[PDB]
Amino acid sequence: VVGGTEAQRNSWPSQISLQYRSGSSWAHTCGGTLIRQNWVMTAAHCVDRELTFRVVVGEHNLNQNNGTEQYVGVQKIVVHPYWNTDDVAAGYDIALLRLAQSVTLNSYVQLGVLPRAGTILANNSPCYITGWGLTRTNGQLAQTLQQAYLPTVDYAICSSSSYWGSTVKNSMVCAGGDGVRSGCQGDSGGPLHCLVNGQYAVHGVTSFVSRLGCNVTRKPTVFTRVSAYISWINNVIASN
């Protein structure tokens, strides 16, 4: 997250860190949202590499443990069947991870709230992106979980020629694009949390930013629209 602030440790308890095995260690690569005690929602593109993945729930500072972490292996990966790695503009950038064990819920570890199927946000709706992604274009991952206020940019604006043009689809949510705050590499897969009727719900799965940089005016961060995939999510979980 470029241009954000450190979150409170209990603000975003559905946020997970998706990590891969790197030698004798583990490295954060992506975010995700805990959606059952044994299922995480992330971006398809985060799992294109055939790596060994784990999920960390309750995490806050990737560089300093505080005793609220739980670590669990990824047991099964179900990528959206229409995802194509070489065509992120086509959409379908979503995947579900079944965890090896169910995590324990507490004030740091909670299920994310998903929207009802088909819900679209009015333009300029209030949302926050969260994650450990780069804090500057070509920078480094955050140590502490970051948040940034990123109001939505509706489809009509986001798909206009000076924004994302035909790269954005109605199965996506755009947010931000001021040139100051944005997602960045390493935020992918994580949530866009939007305040509706007094409650935050996870309306987005971080999918892409511009090739030119993370915080780029008229290139809002682009998320998979969770509410386009409710039936898919429920069908995968019921089948597995």
XYZ file of C-alpha atoms in Angstrom:
240
model
C 0.000 0.000 0.000
C 1.433 3.327 -1.147
C 0.493 6.365 0.884
C -1.310 4.532 3.672
C -1.018 4.345 7.467
C -0.360 1.541 9.869
C -3.636 -0.247 10.780
C -4.687 -0.991 14.325
C -3.892 -4.642 15.072
C -7.577 -5.602 15.438
C -9.071 -3.512 12.624
C -8.883 -6.027 9.781
C -8.983 -9.492 11.375
C -9.920 -11.264 8.121
C -6.699 -10.114 6.412
C -4.230 -12.966 5.855
C -0.630 -13.156 4.640
C -0.086 -15.748 1.890
C 3.502 -16.922 2.055
C 5.698 -19.299 0.073
C 8.556 -21.501 1.143
C 11.839 -19.904 0.302
C 14.749 -22.080 1.395
C 14.400 -22.696 5.128
C 12.180 -19.670 5.492
C 8.858 -18.278 4.396
C 8.219 -15.112 2.363
C 5.089 -13.031 2.086
C 3.828 -12.808 -1.481
C 0.138 -11.863 -1.355
C -2.808 -11.002 0.777
C -6.076 -12.870 1.163
C -9.306 -12.825 3.152
C -10.307 -15.524 5.616
C -13.865 -16.491 4.572
C -14.379 -19.685 6.628
C -12.240 -21.083 9.407
C -10.601 -23.346 6.785
C -10.933 -21.267 3.576
C -9.157 -18.204 2.216
C -10.119 -16.071 -0.787
C -7.178 -14.655 -2.788
C -6.241 -13.734 -6.364
C -5.677 -16.498 -8.918
C -2.488 -14.845 -10.093
C -0.942 -15.212 -6.617
C -0.960 -18.971 -6.982
C 0.226 -19.330 -10.692
C 3.624 -20.507 -9.357
C 3.737 -24.053 -8.148
C 5.128 -23.171 -4.767
C 4.538 -24.443 -1.280
C 2.135 -21.976 0.311
C 1.031 -21.276 3.872
C -1.416 -18.791 5.346
C -0.775 -16.655 8.411
C -3.841 -15.379 10.254
C -3.768 -12.779 13.000
C -0.592 -11.267 11.522
C 0.416 -7.656 11.957
C 4.194 -7.154 11.740
C 5.893 -9.544 9.257
C 9.223 -8.784 10.905
C 8.330 -9.105 14.598
C 6.109 -11.757 16.160
C 3.636 -10.714 18.834
C 1.975 -14.017 19.697
C -1.309 -13.523 17.827
C -0.212 -15.358 14.670
C -1.494 -18.745 13.598
C 0.261 -20.580 10.743
C -1.527 -23.122 8.565
C -0.617 -24.978 5.391
C -2.566 -24.627 2.139
C -4.091 -28.042 1.494
C -6.030 -27.426 -1.751
C -6.079 -24.595 -4.300
C -9.153 -23.997 -6.481
C -8.494 -21.332 -9.091
C -11.411 -19.860 -11.080
C -11.643 -22.143 -14.158
C -11.769 -19.202 -16.578
C -8.597 -17.524 -15.201
C -5.785 -17.041 -17.787
C -2.392 -15.957 -16.397
C -1.518 -14.195 -19.679
C -4.767 -12.197 -19.769
C -5.328 -10.508 -16.395
C -7.591 -7.961 -18.149
C -10.079 -10.652 -18.920
C -10.808 -11.032 -15.208
C -11.549 -14.128 -13.176
C -8.606 -13.223 -10.902
C -9.851 -15.183 -7.893
C -8.953 -18.416 -6.153
C -9.970 -20.260 -2.993
C -7.511 -21.992 -0.647
C -8.618 -24.781 1.680
C -6.454 -24.746 4.790
C -5.006 -27.901 6.357
C -6.639 -27.083 9.654
C -9.363 -24.677 10.845
C -7.983 -21.567 12.509
C -9.158 -20.322 15.888
C -11.197 -17.121 15.856
C -10.404 -14.246 18.220
C -10.194 -10.453 18.054
C -7.310 -10.758 15.568
C -8.772 -13.593 13.438
C -12.328 -13.283 12.059
C -14.191 -14.189 8.887
C -14.560 -11.483 6.262
C -18.058 -10.406 5.374
C -18.840 -10.750 1.713
C -21.433 -8.697 -0.156
C -24.614 -10.212 -1.535
C -24.451 -11.382 -5.082
C -24.565 -8.636 -7.681
C -24.000 -5.702 -5.306
C -22.382 -2.680 -7.095
C -21.076 0.292 -5.139
C -22.011 3.897 -6.155
C -19.120 5.949 -7.421
C -16.928 7.345 -4.656
C -18.036 4.793 -2.102
C -15.865 4.648 1.057
C -13.419 1.734 1.142
C -10.010 0.835 2.520
C -7.338 -1.344 0.953
C -5.138 -3.257 3.396
C -1.939 -5.208 2.995
C 1.787 -5.634 3.387
C 2.579 -4.746 -0.219
C 5.212 -2.304 -1.357
C 4.975 1.121 0.212
C 6.393 2.780 -2.901
C 6.589 1.800 -6.545
C 9.694 -0.412 -6.809
C 10.042 -0.219 -3.027
C 9.828 -2.933 -0.358
C 7.059 -4.679 1.512
C 5.670 -3.037 4.614
C 6.648 -4.441 7.976
C 3.307 -3.560 9.626
C -0.092 -4.014 8.032
C -1.047 -0.866 6.118
C -4.387 0.638 5.253
C -5.374 3.370 2.811
C -8.680 5.051 2.138
C -9.483 4.288 -1.524
C -12.907 5.443 -2.633
C -14.398 3.586 -5.545
C -14.344 4.693 -9.164
C -17.393 3.313 -10.932
C -17.262 1.277 -14.141
C -18.354 4.128 -16.437
C -15.427 6.252 -15.262
C -12.891 3.490 -14.746
C -13.447 2.005 -18.218
C -13.219 5.418 -19.933
C -10.246 5.946 -22.274
C -8.113 8.119 -19.962
C -8.579 5.626 -17.080
C -8.282 1.905 -17.825
C -10.291 1.813 -21.029
C -11.264 -1.710 -22.149
C -8.860 -3.311 -19.656
C -11.446 -2.942 -16.887
C -14.531 -5.100 -16.874
C -17.808 -4.950 -14.935
C -16.558 -7.957 -12.935
C -13.961 -5.634 -11.367
C -14.023 -2.789 -8.829
C -11.711 0.209 -9.255
C -10.675 2.353 -6.308
C -8.370 5.311 -5.826
C -6.312 6.657 -8.566
C -5.617 10.015 -6.939
C -1.853 9.542 -7.556
C -1.141 9.423 -3.815
C -2.717 6.251 -2.394
C -2.896 2.803 -3.971
C -2.301 -0.882 -3.752
C 1.094 -2.170 -4.839
C 2.882 -5.461 -5.440
C 2.353 -7.771 -2.492
C -1.147 -6.428 -1.818
C -2.564 -8.671 -4.562
C -5.157 -11.126 -3.325
C -6.042 -9.054 -0.304
C -9.225 -7.215 0.528
C -10.890 -3.980 -0.417
C -13.108 -3.358 2.622
C -16.107 -1.085 1.963
C -18.371 0.451 4.563
C -22.047 -0.238 3.851
C -24.852 0.275 6.367
C -22.348 0.580 9.154
C -20.400 -2.608 8.492
C -17.281 -3.322 6.457
C -17.567 -6.026 3.832
C -14.890 -7.318 1.477
C -15.975 -6.098 -1.962
C -12.638 -6.562 -3.748
C -9.720 -8.954 -4.211
C -6.674 -6.886 -5.241
C -5.807 -7.803 -8.833
C -3.614 -5.233 -10.633
C -2.054 -1.807 -10.831
C -0.473 -0.052 -13.795
C 2.715 -1.296 -15.413
C 4.041 2.270 -14.910
C 3.630 2.370 -11.220
C 1.417 1.673 -8.247
C 0.054 5.149 -7.482
C -0.614 6.641 -10.888
C -3.278 9.214 -11.558
C -6.190 7.822 -13.567
C -4.963 4.246 -13.026
C -6.935 3.293 -9.884
C -6.104 0.024 -8.212
C -8.212 -2.743 -9.772
C -9.859 -5.497 -7.768
C -11.866 -8.557 -8.684
C -15.478 -7.755 -7.722
C -16.298 -10.299 -5.010
C -20.020 -9.876 -5.537
C -19.649 -11.220 -9.119
C -18.463 -14.564 -7.730
C -20.712 -15.351 -4.740
C -22.305 -18.345 -6.381
C -18.904 -19.616 -7.545
C -17.423 -19.247 -4.053
C -20.336 -21.034 -2.426
C -20.262 -23.826 -4.997
C -16.520 -24.439 -4.523
C -16.836 -24.557 -0.736
C -19.942 -26.835 -0.821
C -18.126 -29.243 -3.188
C -14.916 -29.404 -1.173
